[PDB]
Structure formats: C-alpha cells, structure tokens
Design a protein around this nucleic acid. Sequence first.
DNA 1: ATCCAGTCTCC
DNA 2: GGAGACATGGA
Length: 229
Amino acid sequence: RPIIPANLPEDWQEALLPEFSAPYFHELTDFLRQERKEYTIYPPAPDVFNALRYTPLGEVKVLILGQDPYHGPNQAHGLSFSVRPGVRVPPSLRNIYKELTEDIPGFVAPKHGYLRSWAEQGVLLLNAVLTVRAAQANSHQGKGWEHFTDAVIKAVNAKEERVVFILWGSYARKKKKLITGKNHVVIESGHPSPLSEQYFFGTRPFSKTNEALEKAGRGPVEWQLPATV
DNA sequence: ATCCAGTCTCC
DNA sequence: GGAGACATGGA
Ligand SMILES: [Cl-]
C-alpha cells in the first residue's frame, strides 16, 4: 500500500503520489522505522514533511535546498534551517543572518530562528535528505531520500512561472541538472554552516533571488523576520 | 581549553 | 568513497 503522509496540500499529494507508492520509498520508510527504533532521529516523525505542508506546490516561488536537518536536540522541525521560538539560533542560521544583513539593506537579524514567515511567502525550505541520526551529519545520506527530493525538485521545475532555486552545499547542488525549466533560475554556493562558510559568505543569494523574481513579474520575498514570534 | 558547528585535493 | 587538510567562534 502507498505510505502517504497526512495533511499535505492536494497539489503535493497529486504530484508526489507515485513516490509514496514506489518500492524505493517503501524501503526508505522501513529503514527509517528501524533507525527510529535503535537511535534518536531528527526531526520528529510528525514534522518530516512540514516544508510541503507550509508551502503548497502552487505557491512555491523560491526553493531553498540544504543538506540534511539539524542533528541536535529540539532543533529541526521540517523547515530547513528554522528553529522554534525559544530555541538558540544555530550557527548556520547565524551565518544566514550575517549574509542577509550585508546583502539586503535594512535587514535586522532577530533574536529567534523561526522561519515560518518565509514559508508563508512561497519559500520552500527543503533539505536534500529529510532525516538525520542525532549527532551525525549526513548519516541518512544515500538511503532513498534523494530520489524523493529529486521528485520534489522535478515537480517544482515543471511549473511554468519562474522559481528561484537556491542550492546550498555539495549534496544540494547534485540537483542542479534537474532544473531545466526555461524560466527558472539557479543560485548555488557552499552551505552556510561555519564549516563551509568561506564558500557561502559574499554570494548574495537573497538579493539575486529578489532581482530574478522581479524581472519575471513575481513579487520579491520579504526577507525581514518579525522581531518576536 | 575542549568541543563542536562542510568541501577540497588525489587515488 | 576514503583519508586527511583545513574548516570556527562560541557555550
Ligand atoms: Cl534543518
């Protein structure tokens, strides 16, 4: 039987039905059940598909693709790079904020790390791999997620209206060949982790995104976050 | 003071 | 991919 996540927007359910029905996805699911039995796996299972829940396929105008979820306790909750109200801003997101402060005039980094207000504007906050074992970055690489996130990329690429794809890191950048739509734009760099920050700083992805959207008659993203959440 | 938050080079 | 070099600014 297909293993279909609950409460997805209908457009995602229709686009991704073949994935939820596929043998590779059944095998990925079985592996993840074993992993959750034997280890602490992030994010919590109810949150794994939250990026799709918060940004319907029809609303996507920017697709941010990181590597894999944050791998410490109470960090990841399915929107890449985001943390819940109350949670310390992780290093990657501190670096995102540093780059925004330089790239977008007037951006003021808030004390929180909650990025829901970006998802609500059409920014799909994805990672190439959607789960991780505690303390072990990229521990779930190469187990089936990449086929599923290829399918997500492909569904967005099939849209006619311009989407900006921002590929952060080597693993996310493997998706570049799938982005063939004539109206789409790809921005790529190193990941914003402090361990790769020399490959991220100065790449101006936020302004480049807004310029591309504007030239296509799409509205820019409001990158400023609320001061409190 | 230690620990802990990627990607390049050769084979 | 494997092994190692070089990767950081804070709690
Ligand atoms: Cl994440």
